[PDB]
Design a protein around this ligand. Structure first.
Ligand SMILES: Cc1ccc(Cl)c(N(CC#N)c2cc(Nc3ccc(OC[C@H](O)CN(C)C)cc3)ncn2)c1
Ligand SMILES: [Mg+2]
Lengths: 257, 293
């Protein structure tokens, strides 16, 4: 607890400032939620192939949603936007980012290196170099410190749920990272241990089950329908022993809220 | 874009890129301009520096004023401070620095650094060359090219971190997690150095560095630093030196000064004093803001 609380407080303020605009997709003349779902799911694959941090994936997705909040993009250029965003998030967050050729290569030469680098400067310009956005992952990690005791299945499952919410702009563009992380932590905790969102996290965050319910009802249906969703790279990723096989766990039939 | 700046003179060379003193021809304002020739796109050091300085508005953190961003070059426009602490310390050879200035400087650095740690930023390169001073008596943290945004709790970040002389023993012993404590350590070494005007642990290598720290503070065991003997780069053949009487470490220092430096140079990162908690130390009970010479 040196600065854990100054930091939570700051991340709460910055998450409001860093928020994508909830309705941007209707204003997009050419792309859909489904297309964004495809692009996120590819980004998950890419993070797996290059062994990138979960944080780096959450960051890039933030960069994309905020970029698409002010910038109209044709469907054949969406992958370019997502490539630059993942390259930028790697530079921000990784000890060893992949090099720019590695990013060109995985588009399957859809784009040149010049295009990827020109897109990078453009994304920087639109985001005004504001790259230290709060993420669901950053909130979860603080919430984990409130477990009694720590439970790796609970952590990996909360990460798995928080990650699935990246895929589906409807409904998750409408929730803040701290709230999604709230739902995710509780739903993880309940599925594995039977326990609920602790009182100590009510004290810390001011959120209760009641305030979490709307996000939580959505997240529950995502978890239930996960095996049938068109996008499946988070499910496969989280079958790995690194995340304790949690995508293999059974969702609870009801939450008793 | 650079149409309104007139170059005055080159300052030197940063973590990356080249720094000139310039003035705004319309406002009169004096600036430091870091030029970045733009490969692999925008350097990760420049991306981190810009995002993190834009978040950090504090009297004791250098102001990034603007980013001028062309397909060719990227310029960072900083407010200009008259010198760094290193040049000041060299100039104070024969005077030495008055206690009231040392105290005021440390108080200020601990203010800049607390603000950084509150805003989840590690500086990771505190040294006198990165600490800038004006004529009114302010000192400010600069060069956020090695800085990073951290999580709670920390993950493993870059090992290859901190100019060697200012580098914390948890970095040198290869701990998989370091945190805010590595910047307190560096400020310990600099507090010591403002008082003696030489570096406290001028090692030439990682092992030379550790041994110097050990001869001053004692080789740490499991009583002083639970977990040391399990750290990756701990070796049980380490010579075991006695801890020195702390009044010997920096002899001009009074009791409260020693107490403070001792808490900053605590081995165990977890027991090392925070920048926040150090602001309230009795050392600072009479603190003022004198101008320097
Ligand atoms: C390059 C260099 C190194 C470290 C830094 Cl933080 C900076 N930056 C950019 C940032 N952030 C400055 C410098 C400055 N003023 C100054 C700094 C040193 C200095 O040193 C004088 C001597 O010439 C040093 N020497 C003997 C080698 C003179 C003026 N004011 C504002 N920003 C530039
Ligand atoms: Mg549309």
């Amino acid at each position: 607890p040196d600065y854990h609380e100054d930091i939570h407080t700051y991340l709460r303020e910055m998450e409001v400032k860093c928020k994508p605009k909830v309705g941007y997709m209707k204003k997009q003349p050419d792309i859909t939620n489904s297309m964004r779902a495809i692009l996120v799911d590819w980004l998950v694959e890419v993070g797996e192939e290059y062994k990138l941090q979960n944080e780096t994936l959450h960051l890039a997705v933030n960069y994309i949603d905020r970029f698409l909040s002010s910038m109209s993009v044709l469907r054949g250029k969406l992958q370019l936007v997502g490539t630059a965003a993942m390259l930028l998030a790697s530079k921000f967050e990784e000890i060893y980012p992949p090099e720019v050729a590695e990013f060109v290569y995985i588009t399957d030469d859809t784009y040149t290196k010049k295009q990827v680098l020109r897109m990078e400067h453009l994304v920087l310009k639109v985001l005004t170099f504001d790259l230290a956005a709060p993420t669901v992952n950053q909130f979860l990690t603080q919430y984990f410190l409130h477990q009694q005791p720590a439970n790796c299945k609970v952590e990996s499952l909360a990460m798995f749920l928080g990650e699935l919410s990246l895929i589906d702009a409807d409904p998750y563009l409408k929730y803040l990272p701290s709230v999604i992380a709230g739902a995710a932590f509780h739903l993880a905790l309940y599925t594995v241990t039977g326990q609920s969102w602790p009182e100590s996290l009510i004290r810390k965050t001011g959120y209760t089950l009641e305030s979490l319910k709307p996000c939580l009802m959505d997240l529950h249906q995502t978890y239930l329908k996960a095996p049938q969703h068109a996008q499946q790279s988070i499910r496969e990723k989280y079958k790995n022993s690194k995340y304790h096989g949690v995508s293999l766990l059974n969702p609870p039939e009801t939450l008793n809220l | 874009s650079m149409e309104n700046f007139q170059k005055v003179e080159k300052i030197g060379e940063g973590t990356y890129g080249v720094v000139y003193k310039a003035r705004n021809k319309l406002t009169g304002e004096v600036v430091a301009l870091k030029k970045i020739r733009l490969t692999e796109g925008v350097p990760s050091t420049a991306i981190r520096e810009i995002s993190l300085l834009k978040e950090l508005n504090h009297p004791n953190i250098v102001k990034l004023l603007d980013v001028i961003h062309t397909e060719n070059k990227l310029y960072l426009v900083f407010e200009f401070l008259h010198q760094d602490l290193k040049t000041f310390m060299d100039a104070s050879a024969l005077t030495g620095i008055p206690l009231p200035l040392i105290k005021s400087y440390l108080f200020q650095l601990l203010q800049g650094l607390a603000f950084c740690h509150s805003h989840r930023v590690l500086h990771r390169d505190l040294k006198p060359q990165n600490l800038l001073i004006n004529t009114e008596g302010a000192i400010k943290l600069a060069d956020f090219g090695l800085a990073r945004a951290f999580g709670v709790p920390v993950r493993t970040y870059t090992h290859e971190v901190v100019t060697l002389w200012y580098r914390a023993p948890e970095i040198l012993l290869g701990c998989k997690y370091y945190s805010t404590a590595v910047d307190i350590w560096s400020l310990g070494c600099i507090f010591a150095e403002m008082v003696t005007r030489r570096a406290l642990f001028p090692g030439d290598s990682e092992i030379d560095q550790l041994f110097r720290i050990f001869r001053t503070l004692g080789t740490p065991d499991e009583v002083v630093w639970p977990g040391v003997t399990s750290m990756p780069d701990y070796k049980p053949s380490f010579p075991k030196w006695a801890r020195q009487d702390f009044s010997k470490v920096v002899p001009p220092l009074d009791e409260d000064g020693r107490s403070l430096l001792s808490q900053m140079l605590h081995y165990d990162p977890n027991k090392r004093i925070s920048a926040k908690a150090a602001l309230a130390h009795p050392f600072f009970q009479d603190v003022t803001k004198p101008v320097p010479h």
